[PDB]
Amino acid sequence: RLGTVLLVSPKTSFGRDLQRTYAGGLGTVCKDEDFLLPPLDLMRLAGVLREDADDIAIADEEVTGVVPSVEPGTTVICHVSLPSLLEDAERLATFRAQGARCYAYTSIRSPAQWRTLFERGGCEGVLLPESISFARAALAGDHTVPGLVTPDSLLDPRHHQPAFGDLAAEPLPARDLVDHTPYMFPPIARTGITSINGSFGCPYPCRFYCPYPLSEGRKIRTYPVERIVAEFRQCAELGITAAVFRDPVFSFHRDRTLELCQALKAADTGVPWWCETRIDRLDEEVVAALVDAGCVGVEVGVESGDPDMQATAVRKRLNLDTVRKFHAVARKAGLKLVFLFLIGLPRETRMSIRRTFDFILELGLADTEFNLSVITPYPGTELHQIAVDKGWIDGSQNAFTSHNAVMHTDELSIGDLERASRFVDELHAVCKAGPAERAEFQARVHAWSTGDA
Ligand SMILES: N[C@H]1[C@@H](O[C@H]2[C@H](O)[C@@H](O)[C@H](N)C[C@@H]2N)O[C@H](CO)[C@@H](O)[C@@H]1O
Numbered sequence: 001r002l003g004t005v006l007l008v009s010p011k012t013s014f015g016r017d018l019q020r021t022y023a024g025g026l027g028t029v030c031k032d033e034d035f036l037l038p039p040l041d042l043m044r045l046a047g048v049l050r051e052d053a054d055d056i057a058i059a060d061e062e063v064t065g066v067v068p069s070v071e072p073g074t075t076v077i078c079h080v081s082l083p084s085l086l087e088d089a090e091r092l093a094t095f096r097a098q099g100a101r102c103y104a105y106t107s108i109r110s111p112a113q114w115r116t117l118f119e120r121g122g123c124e125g126v127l128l129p130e131s132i133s134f135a136r137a138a139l140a141g142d143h144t145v146p147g148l149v150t151p152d153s154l155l156d157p158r159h160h161q162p163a164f165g166d167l168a169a170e171p172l173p174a175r176d177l178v179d180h181t182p183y184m185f186p187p188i189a190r191t192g193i194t195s196i197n198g199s200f201g202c203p204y205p206c207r208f209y210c211p212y213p214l215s216e217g218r219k220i221r222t223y224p225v226e227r228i229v230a231e232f233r234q235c236a237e238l239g240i241t242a243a244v245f246r247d248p249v250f251s252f253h254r255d256r257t258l259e260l261c262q263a264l265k266a267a268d269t270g271v272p273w274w275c276e277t278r279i280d281r282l283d284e285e286v287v288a289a290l291v292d293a294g295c296v297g298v299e300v301g302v303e304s305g306d307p308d309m310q311a312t313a314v315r316k317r318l319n320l321d322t323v324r325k326f327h328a329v330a331r332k333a334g335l336k337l338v339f340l341f342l343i344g345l346p347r348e349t350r351m352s353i354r355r356t357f358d359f360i361l362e363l364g365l366a367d368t369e370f371n372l373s374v375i376t377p378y379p380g381t382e383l384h385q386i387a388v389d390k391g392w393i394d395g396s397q398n399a400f401t402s403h404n405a406v407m408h409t410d411e412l413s414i415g416d417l418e419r420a421s422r423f424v425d426e427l428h429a430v431c432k433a434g435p436a437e438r439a440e441f442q443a444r445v446h447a448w449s450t451g452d453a
């Protein structure tokens with residue numbers, strides 16, 4: 001049945017600097033954001049609903065424009081992020097006041113925030129990642145369905161053990177329902193790029209701070225390679241210029257990765273792609289396979305440039321010399337790189353932060369081959385609860401931008417972390433410039449790390 005359905009990534013005061021897909025689907029906000037990705041989750045929902053829906057459309061109001069109004073009676077699904085949960089609850093109440101049977105889609109696993117969605121937003125339910133596979137039943141009324149949160153049984157312990165349905169029978173995302181031209185991925189193409197998943201979840205212990213296992217579960221759940229190949233053929237046929245994999249650890253299964261590479265090569269879709277993965281799930285053979293299969297580059301997590309931080313707080317048992325050797329193998333194979341760094345994990349000191357910057361300049365990374373995040377305690381992670389029990393969070397959640405200093409540790413004050421927060425803007429500007437700016441930035445960081453005012 002279903003009737004008219006409109007899936008909307010609502011408008012916010014953040015603009016397109018808000019990228020709802022990142023940080024485990026809770027959203028990042030990065031000033032002058034040039035990684036503008038399409039509303040993948042809404043497209044997957046459209047893909048599963050499209051069979052039993054009279055009409056269905058997708059509206060990224062930051063691109064297509066704000067939906068003027070809705071006709072009363074139709075379903076509206078909004079994408080609620082974390083740093084804009086209030087604005088998206090307001091948009092959800094706006095659709096409710098026009099007789100829309102409102103729903104909400106989010107990766108937020110915090111019954112406290114769901115409360116705000118049923119109260120201000122007035123949602124007949126809240127949809128979570130697990131719900132996508134069953135998104136039909138959810139709107140048919142069934143509530144024993146995973147990923148669907150009523151305001152009734154708002155504290156069922158099923159919503160912290162994400163039961164994932166049969167991923168292999170999921171329809172392809174309705175990528176044909178969205179003009180991909182306004183979507184950008186600078187390291188590959190400036191127009192018409194799309195996002196894609198080949199697997200979900202992550203089992204690693206750095207779930208202490210990272211939200212990806214919280215949003216997606218601690219179990220790797222893969223799609224069949226032949227579905228991903230079908231997606232690449234779909235992208236070529238639609239005229240999409242690039243495909244960006246959102247898998248937290250794309251190369252987790254090594255043999256599966258080589259098989260997927262060979263299959264993508266055989267398909268000869270001529271679609272270039274990008275992926276995210278751990279350094280310790282990459283070796284020379286797998287890198288060669290990726291470059292050969294059409295992968296332009298990878299985002300890998302280094303987090304810190306301080307050896308002791310690697311042996312403790314980073315929780316990856318990642319060695320800095322392994323990072324160096326991987327840098328050599330990746331440049332020597334022509335794979336583009338973006339190293340992912342993190343400032344302000346508990347146990348971090350000034351000299352630790354400075355040694356991170358020291359590592360970034362030692363490696364000689366262009367401005368485009370690194371990204372620095374400021375530690376933000378995402379609700380549902382162990383770090384957020386330890387941060388509450390220690391009065392660590394000084395900022396409000398509408399600044400839970402992955403780049404705003406919003407919490408201090410037992411070793412660092414928000415003045416130190418806000419200072420570093422601005423030092424990352426300095427590092428980008430200074431990496432755009434020449435050696436003379438990088439030596440005077442490296443002087444400042446040394447002086448700031450020593451003194452300890
Ligand atoms: N792909 C990872 C990476 O995402 C970043 C990306 O590296 C950066 O180049 C963009 N300008 C902003 C974008 N949020 O870093 C983010 C954290 O800052 C992670 O949440 C995300 O999964």
Ligand SMILES: C[C@H]1O[C@@H](n2cnc3c(N)ncnc32)[C@H](O)[C@@H]1O
Binds near residue numbers: 373
């Ligand atoms: C998924 C990527 O995002 C970064 N990352 C992981 N957890 C956090 C957090 N709590 N706050 C800010 N950035 C984080 C890491 O660098 C990782 O590589």
Ligand code: SF4
Binds near residue numbers: 206
């Ligand atoms: S492996 Fe990557 S995505 Fe997974 S928890 Fe660790 S940092 Fe986060």
